[PDB]
Amino acid sequence: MKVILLEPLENLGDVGQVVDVKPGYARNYLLPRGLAVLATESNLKALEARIRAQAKRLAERKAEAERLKEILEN
RNA sequence: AAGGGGACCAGCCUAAACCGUCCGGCUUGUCCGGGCGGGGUCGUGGGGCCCUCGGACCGAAUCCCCAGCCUAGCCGAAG
Ligand SMILES: [Mg+2]
Ligand SMILES: [Mg+2]
Ligand SMILES: [Mg+2]
Ligand SMILES: [Mg+2]
Ligand SMILES: [Mg+2]
Ligand SMILES: [Mg+2]
Ligand SMILES: [Mg+2]
Ligand SMILES: [Mg+2]
Ligand SMILES: [Mg+2]
Ligand SMILES: [Mg+2]
Ligand SMILES: [Mg+2]
Ligand SMILES: [Mg+2]
Ligand SMILES: [Mg+2]
Ligand SMILES: [Mg+2]
């Protein structure tokens, strides 16, 4: 069973990673402990949506630097 | 059972893509979900979206009217 880690987990994976676990481990441990969520298509895109936002919002912060950098230093 | 001969005769609505819209969620958005409306319904495959061309017939199983029919009856020849 594929799930999306919501946390870093020992020898499983880092947050946002999609890994294969036994259906039982997910159903009766991971899911009700909020440590992960099932790797369905509905929230697969919802995952990608925020990787994308985090991607954009990061590079906007870098663009602000180079604008501020080229202004000063020159 | 197919086939042949007859009785009767009729074909339709959706799901999904895509658009809209109201709400809900916090994992903040080009988000996810639930409603609702639009769209679409096919096997020669059909539909969706993007270009080019073209701009009235058909009609209900629903509703309305009516005829007819039913639920009482009546006239009816000649010792
Ligand atoms: Mg037959
Ligand atoms: Mg026959
Ligand atoms: Mg026929
Ligand atoms: Mg519809
Ligand atoms: Mg909706
Ligand atoms: Mg709909
Ligand atoms: Mg419709
Ligand atoms: Mg329609
Ligand atoms: Mg239609
Ligand atoms: Mg064919
Ligand atoms: Mg086609
Ligand atoms: Mg009809
Ligand atoms: Mg009499
Ligand atoms: Mg008499």
Swiss-Prot record:
Q: What cellular component GO annotations does this protein have?
A: ribonucleoprotein complex; ribosome
In alphabetical order, the GO MF annotations are: rRNA binding; structural constituent of ribosome
**A biological process from GO:** translation
- The UniProt record lists the keyword rRNA-binding: yes
Q: Magnesium: is it a keyword of this entry? A: no
- Signal sequence annotation: none
Q: Which UniProt keywords apply?
A: Ribonucleoprotein, Ribosomal protein, RNA-binding, rRNA-binding
Homology family? Belongs to the bacterial ribosomal protein bL9 family.
Functionally, this protein is described as follows: Binds to the 23S rRNA. Extends more that 50 Angstroms beyond the surface of the 70S ribosome.
Q: How does it assemble?
A: Part of the 50S ribosomal subunit.
Q: What is this protein called?
A: Large ribosomal subunit protein bL9
